[PDB]
Amino acid sequence: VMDVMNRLILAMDLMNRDDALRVTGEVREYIDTVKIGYPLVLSEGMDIIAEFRKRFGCRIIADFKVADIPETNEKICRATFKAGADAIIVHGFPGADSVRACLNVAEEMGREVFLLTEMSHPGAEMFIQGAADEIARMGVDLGVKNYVGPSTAPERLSRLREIIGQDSFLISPGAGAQGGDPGETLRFADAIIVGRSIYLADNPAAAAAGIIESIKDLL
Amino acid sequence: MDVMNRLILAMDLMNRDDALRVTGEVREYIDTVKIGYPLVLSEGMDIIAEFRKRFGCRIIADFKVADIPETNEKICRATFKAGADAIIVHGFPGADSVRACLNVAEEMGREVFLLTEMSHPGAEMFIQGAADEIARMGVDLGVKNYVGPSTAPERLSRLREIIGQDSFLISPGAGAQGGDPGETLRFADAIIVGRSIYLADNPAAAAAGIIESIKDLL
Ligand SMILES: O=c1cc(O)n([C@@H]2O[C@H](COP(=O)(O)O)[C@@H](O)[C@H]2O)c(=O)[nH]1
Ligand SMILES: O=c1cc(O)n([C@@H]2O[C@H](COP(=O)(O)O)[C@@H](O)[C@H]2O)c(=O)[nH]1
């Protein structure tokens, strides 16, 4: 499994190239894994992945929540890996064929798929929560090894870890700004994803170091 | 929304030169183009302004927005800054995520399309069972624009029943995926068509032919 420094993944959702680069550079000593999503990619282009790889010693997870038909999923993954992303995040709710399309490209291209099985925000309760156990089990059946589950619902996160087993790799957003607790989350997740708590802080470095100190015994 | 010939081109080619050439070849038949991540992630968001400059077409950004509300807001803002007229959003992540998109669209004078049910076989596993409830959620939220599948006309008809005749409904899956243009337009306002046109030996003749086959529905 990828070796995530300090069990901490920066969610770089600033939409300005200069700011994203400044903040990411400032926390570089604490984090070697960066999640880049559409807020930044749609603002600055896929070349932002190239610039991050040039500037920092960071793994790149493309948080694109892939959610299309299999044929379109295939193209999205091909474009994303071509640009230099190490991994891509895909939704499981569109079903098994859509997930397998992504797995097949990642296999061909030598990269990784993460499966998002359940989400951290209130709206996740309406439709996703009820499908989550089955989406997770479908992931296991398809051979998915990397997963995403919510920091804001420890009870649900614990169940996800059960389903996927101790050998699978699990990352979790929702600590900090959304109210999730880093320590409790790391009881089940391999790494926490953290965005605003860090990138909106007056001192992103101090904020990152503070999170890390709070979980020191877990490293 | 007034779509020429009830036909929306899904431009999923991933090369700028081919995308522009093929769109130019069928321009006389359409005035609405769906641009998705295959083209955008390959060529950049500047392609949206390039299409408007070359064709003056309306642009629907098919980004299947499916994140938390805060991120959805950022995605729509970036998308509309690029010149998109409309954006397609998933309903499965729930109401707050959809409302986030509605807010930005209102702020920038754009439209949100709610994808309530999909066209491919995997849609049966999780989406189909939620689809009616997602459509009702759209109605509750004041959504007026919807997306549903040409490959399942009985499901598309049910979607039309829920949203009413006043809402706008577009539908992918005709052609390559096996849907029928004429049957689909019994329920949808417009059909979305990609491969049947953009992979055809002669895209212009392909578009013309589809239109010929539905000429009585125009
Ligand atoms: O269920 C999920 C899945 C996500 O990818 N995310 C993503 O994780 C990040 C969380 O950032 P933040 O720490 O600012 O709340 C955002 O990029 C968001 O899109 C989430 O918040 N909840
Ligand atoms: O349920 C859906 C929703 C879609 O947006 N689409 C999109 O509609 C287009 C269909 O293209 P095609 O005519 O080549 O099958 C693709 O861009 C696809 O991503 C779909 O096929 N099914």
- The DSSP code sequence of chain B is ---GGGEEEEE----HHHHHHHHHHTTTT-SEEEEEHHHHHHH-THHHHHHHHHH--EEEEEEEE-S-HHHHHHHHHHHHHTT-SEEEEESTT-HHHHHHHHHHHHHHT-EEEEE-S-SSGGGGTTHHHHHHHHHHHHHHHT--EEE--TT-HHHHHHHHHHH-TTSEEEE--BSTTSB-HHHHTTT-SEEEE-HHHHTSSSHHHHHHHHHHHTGGG-
How far is residue A55's CA from residue A44's CA, in Å, rounded to a whole number? 16
- Residue B31 has a CB neighbour count (10 Å cut-off) of 17
B143 exposure class (CB count in 10 Å sphere: 0-12, 13-18, 19+): buried
Give the closest residue to A172 by CA, choosing from A11, A2, A38, A6.
Answer: A11
B148 touches ligand 2 (CB under 6 Å) = no
Instruction: Report how far ligand 1's centroid is from the alpha carbon of A174 (Å).
Output: 6
CA distances from A194 to A111, A129, B66, B76, B171 (A): 23, 22, 19, 22, 38
Instruction: Report how far ligand 1's centroid is from the alpha carbon of B168 (Å).
Output: 32
* Elucidation technique: X-ray
List residues bridging with A89 in a β-sheet: A114
Structure tokens at B216: 């009585």
Which region, left, alpha or beta, applies to residue B13 given φ > 0 means left and ψ of -120 to 50 means alpha? beta
Contact call for residues B43 and B16 (beta carbons, < 8 A): yes
How far is residue A136's CA from residue A133's CA, in Å, rounded to a whole number? 5
Any A CB within 8 A of B209 CB: no
Of B66, B78, B122, the CB nearest to A95: B122
Cα dihedral value A142, A147, A152, A154, nearest 10: 70
List residues bridging with A175 in a β-sheet: A180
Domain spans in chain A, listed from the N-terminal domain onward? 1-219
Residues of A carrying an active site annotation: 65
Q: Which residue's alpha carbon is at the smallest distance from atom 7 of ligand 1? A: A173
Structural element, H or E, at residue A60? strand A59-66
Contact call for residues B92 and B65 (beta carbons, < 8 A): no
- Residue A127 has a CB neighbour count (10 Å cut-off) of 24
Interacting residues of A150 by C-beta distance below 8 A, sequence separation 6+: A118, A119, A120, A124, A156, A157, A172, A173, A174, A180
List residues bridging with B171 in a β-sheet: B191
What is the best residue among A13, A66, A196 to mutate for testing ligand 1's pocket, by most ligand atoms within 8 Å of CB?
A13
Give the closest residue to B85 by CA, choosing from B70, B63, B100.
Answer: B63
Any B CB within 8 A of A1 CB: no
Structure tokens at B15: 């090369």
Q: Which residue's alpha carbon is at the smallest distance from atom 4 of ligand 2? A: B172
Interruption sites in chain B after residues (C→N beyond 2.5 Å): none
Any B CB within 8 A of A142 CB: no
How far is residue A83's CA from residue A70's CA, in Å, rounded to a whole number? 20
How far is residue B155's CA from residue B77's CA, in Å, rounded to a whole number? 32
Closest ligand 1 atom number to CA of residue A197: 13
Q: Which residue has 């059909």 as its token pair? A: B191
Structure tokens at B20: 């522009």
Classify A165 as helix, strand or coil: coil
Backbone angles phi, psi at A175, to 5 degrees: -80, 145
Inter-chain CB proximity A79 and B41 less than 8 Å = yes
Q: Check residue A140 and report its DSSP letter.
A: H
CATH class of A1-219: alpha beta
Structure tokens at A14: 């600033």
How far is residue A182's CA from residue A118's CA, in Å, rounded to a whole number? 18
Any A CB within 8 A of B124 CB: yes
Inter-chain CB proximity A121 and B44 less than 8 Å = no
Any A CB within 8 A of B34 CB: no
Backbone angles phi, psi at B131, to 5 degrees: -60, -45
Give the closest residue to A65 by CA, choosing from B53, B190, B72, B124.
Answer: B72
Structure tokens at B93: 């992540």
Contact call for residues A13 and A195 (beta carbons, < 8 A): yes
What distance, in Å, lies between the first and last C-alpha atoms of chain B? 15
How far is residue A145's CA from residue A138's CA, in Å, rounded to a whole number? 12
Query: Of these residues, B34, B64, B81, B144, which one is catalytic?
Result: B64
Backbone angles phi, psi at A203, to 5 degrees: -130, 85
What distance, in Å, lies between the first and last C-alpha atoms of chain A? 16
Cα dihedral value A182, A187, A191, A196, nearest 10: -20
Of A39, A68, A119, the CB nearest to B78: A39
How far is residue A32's CA from residue A198's CA, in Å, rounded to a whole number? 15
How far is residue B2's CA from residue A145's CA, in Å, rounded to a whole number? 46
Three-state SS letters, B75-95: HHHHHHHCCCCEEEEECCCCH
- Residue B209 has a CB neighbour count (10 Å cut-off) of 14
How far is residue A145's CA from residue A36's CA, in Å, rounded to a whole number? 20
Which CATH code fits B1-218?
3.20.20.70
